[PDB]
Amino acid sequence: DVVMTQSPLSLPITPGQPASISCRSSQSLVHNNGNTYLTWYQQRPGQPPRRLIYQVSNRDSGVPDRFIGSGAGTDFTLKISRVESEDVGIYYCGQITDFPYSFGQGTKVDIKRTVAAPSVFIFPPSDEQLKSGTASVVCLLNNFYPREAKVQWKVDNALQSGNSQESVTEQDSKDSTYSLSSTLTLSKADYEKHKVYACEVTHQGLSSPVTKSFNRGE
Amino acid sequence: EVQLVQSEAEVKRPGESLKISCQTSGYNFPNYWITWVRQMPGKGLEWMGTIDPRDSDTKYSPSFQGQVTISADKSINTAYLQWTSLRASDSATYYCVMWVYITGNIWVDVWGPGVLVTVSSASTKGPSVFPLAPSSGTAALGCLVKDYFPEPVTVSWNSGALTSGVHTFPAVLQSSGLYSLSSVVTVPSSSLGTQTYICNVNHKPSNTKVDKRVEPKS
């Protein structure tokens, strides 16, 4: 019955600055008695969610004054007055007025910092792994901001698809940067039938994509 | 303080049954409900259902009805969520949430720690650790931790002494149904001739400890 839409999906905030998170419902959340029962949750990284706000604007015990809930009808807002390091995480609005209950899709608040380009390194497969019959080639993208990045694999100057997997760290506590690994998996046979292995990296902090490469056997 | 205690992490096979549990601790009265919430990795919160322990009245999400059953045992302040026939798609984190109410819509909202449920056809296997060797400012090296099951693996460098500049990526699920991750560290390049770097890999489900020294090789 009720569909919650939350925006934006990600929200970069300079520390000390406010964050505003929106939540819209497909029908008015005002119950038949004349009250509204929207809630807001915070999920710190690795942590269970905890409720911040209930009944649109009332604060649960122990939650500081800088979390401010507002809204009416179909339009609701959670405002964090001065976002600090301990507020990074995902925020969800919660609808329990009308069955079936639902949560917004979540808004990830991270720390805004100056753009940082990735530092790129490429690792050839060890000779131990090759005796196992599989070749893994690893492209590391280290300490960049923002999160958006694209890596692309080329083998003997031939583009690859569907044979790599990526993983990204969460925002680093100190420098507020992310890092990313992409791993290209080939058979030993396929690996030895080619010569040059390269990864190309695109990121807002680079004027043109960077390529790190190596020559099998060099 | 009130708190919920959840049962321990589970690894199950597709088609098997599973019952997970939630126990109230330190709340007397019966003016509460217990609801179960699913969270896929990287995804948001989903309401699965709610039970009134007092009469065992239940409300189910239309998306989970006929896949799970919610039950309660007031005699031990415990609530349950059970599957008859697990599928791989059920691999997720499951939270029980206690809603302490005043027909009223206002309550207080205690989340449990979550339990990780892994449904997979893979069997327990320890990892192979491979060196990501540094090559020819700041240098990068690391360890590829490949082909293990189940989660988790812990990684440290130099027995916990080397901590800054370490990035252990979350593992990814390979098509083999095994997990794989890498851990990397950036180090001063001068240190690569003078110093030794060892990654210490611990996979306790298979009782595997591995110490691999990552050296530049040529």
Author numbering:
A (entry chain B): 1 to 27, 27A, 27B, 27C, 27D, 27E, 28 to 213
B (entry chain A): 1 to 52, 52A, 53 to 82, 82A, 82B, 82C, 83 to 98, 100A, ...
Sentences from the paper on this structure:
The HIV-1 envelope glycoprotein (Env) is the sole target for neutralizing antibody (NAb) responses. The development and structural determination of soluble native-like Env trimer mimics, particularly ones based on the SOSIP technology, has provided a platform for structure-based immunogen design. Here, we describe a detailed characterization of neutralizing and non-neutralizing mAbs isolated from two rhesus macaques (RMs) previously immunized with the BG505 SOSIP.664 trimer. We therefore selected three Fabs (RM20J, RM20F, and RM20E1) that bound to different epitopes for high-resolution structural determination.
We solved a 2.3 Å crystal structure of the unliganded RM20E1 Fab and 4.4 Å cryoEM structure of RM20E1 Fab bound to BG505 SOSIP trimer and Fab PGT122. Half of the rh2011 KC mAbs belonged to the RM20E clonal family, isolated from the week 53 sample. The RM20E clonal family utilized the HC V gene IGHV5-ABI*01_S2502 and the KC V gene LJI.Rh_IGKV2.71. RM20E1 binds to an epitope composed of one gp120 and two gp41 protomers with 1178 Å2 of BSA. Residues 515 to 520 of the FP in the primary gp41 protomer are sandwiched between CDR-H3, CDR-L1, and CDR-L3 of RM20E1. Despite recognition of the conserved FP, RM20E1 did not neutralize the autologous BG505.T332N pseudovirus. The antibody did however potently neutralize the N611A glycan KO BG505 pseudovirus suggesting the epitope is shielded by the N611 glycan. The RM20E1-bound FP conformation is similar to the FP conformation when bound by the bNAb VRC34; however, the inability of RM20E1 to accommodate the N611 glycan likely results in the lack of neutralization of the wild-type virus.
